[PDB]
């Protein structure tokens, strides 16, 4: 009964940028979901198609943990049917999403006096992301018909912008760590099970 390594996800030293969000596959283990839903530190814990307290009684084929860091007032965008820069261009959940979204304030970890510029988000795309799509392209965004040739300028914008988290920012602008758990259930032997 080897424990599922949820600590590797939730307790990692650094999280990924939302545009380059990270995914870890959890399989062949027993997951203690209680340590998640009985924790007081999560300011966002919202599940779809799943009851959080019941999770210790369910088995699944796989679990997928997507982790990233966003702005506080952008936490609302990590949900089905939402719009905005994060949902449109960075991380998109499907309408039929089956799983939980967990988020907590990480100002003490991801903010630096003078600004932490390691966390980025994508500003614009020609089209919205499809569910679970990932765009890590750093190509210059061509806003007009005049081409860009590796040169930023008028209607030629670099597509990634740094959050620049500072400890003195307002709570809506402070960093938040987000983990999205997706529960895959196929007609196959289940590999991720609760303690019961």
């Amino acid at each position, epitope marked *: 009964t080897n424990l599922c390594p949820f600590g590797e996800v939730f307790n990692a030293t650094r999280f990924a940028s939302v545009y380059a969000w990270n995914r870890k596959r959890i399989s*062949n283990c027993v997951a203690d979901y209680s340590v998640l839903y009985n924790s007081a530190s999560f300011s966002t814990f919202k599940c779809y198609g799943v009851s959080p307290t019941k999770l210790n009684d369910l088995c699944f084929t796989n679990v997928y943990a997507d982790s990233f860091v966003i702005r506080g007032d952008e936490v609302r965008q990590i949900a089905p049917g939402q719009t905005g820069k994060i949902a449109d261009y960075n991380y998109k959940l*499907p309408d039929d999403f089956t799983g939980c979204v967990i988020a907590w304030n990480s100002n003490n970890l991801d903010s630096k006096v003078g600004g932490n510029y390691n966390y980025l988000y994508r500003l614009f795309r020609k089209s919205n992301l*499809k569910p679970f*799509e990932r*765009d890590i*392209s750093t190509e210059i965004y061509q806003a007009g018909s005049t081409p860009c040739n590796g040169v930023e300028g008028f209607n030629c914008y670099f597509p990634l912008q740094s959050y620049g988290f500072q400890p003195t920012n307002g709570v809506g602008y402070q960093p938040y760590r987000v983990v999205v758990l997706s529960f895959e259930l196929l007609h*196959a*032997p289940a590999t991720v099970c609760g303690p019961k």
Partner: antibody
Amino acid sequence: QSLEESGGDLVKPGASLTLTCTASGFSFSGSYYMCWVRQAPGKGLEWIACIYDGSYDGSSDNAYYASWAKGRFTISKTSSTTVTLQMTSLTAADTATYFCARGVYFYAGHFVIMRYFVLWGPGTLVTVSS
Amino acid sequence: AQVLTQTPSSVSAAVGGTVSISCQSSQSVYSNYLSWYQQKPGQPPKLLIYDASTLASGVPSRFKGSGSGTQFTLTISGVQCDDAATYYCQGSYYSSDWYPFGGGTEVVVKR
């Protein structure tokens, strides 16, 4: 680390044939999808089907098919080291070398998306002729 | 409904030259899941690049992938004699049952 196709044979038009993909040096444990890609002599590559290798023994569930191949082709996991592809109603257009490939999958909700094909077997040749 | 156009059917360069192979998709490729494969005669396809730029293990760095969206390119900077083979692009989309391959491109080593 190795995949070996077998069962490719000379068959008459209208007949059925079942090909086998045998895994060597490892066993299926739910980490990949097993896929079939064919290539007519002198032509390009055409994807046929995939199946989750964590499926139950003898199951055809968790499978995806190209629209042209759906129903006429059946992919199954028969053991921890074998995946089969059953093809029916064969014609000369089905003459090809059939490759078995590991599919690296990406979970996308109610379905998975094949990211790429890493490991290809040498292939087995199917000749549909009288 | 999703077609990959691979041009041209044949490229050539001397030893040390650069050949460019284009792959155009009628629709944006999901998460830029564009991969390139090398097939030498009598051999199965061999993966060269995945995610449109990531080099597969053991593949020489002279093979380079680039592009995003609907336009992608395979570049062999420093063509060698054993690069004479057929190359294919393959795209993945927001779909569970369509993985088109490109028409293929032959690389001819000029001498």
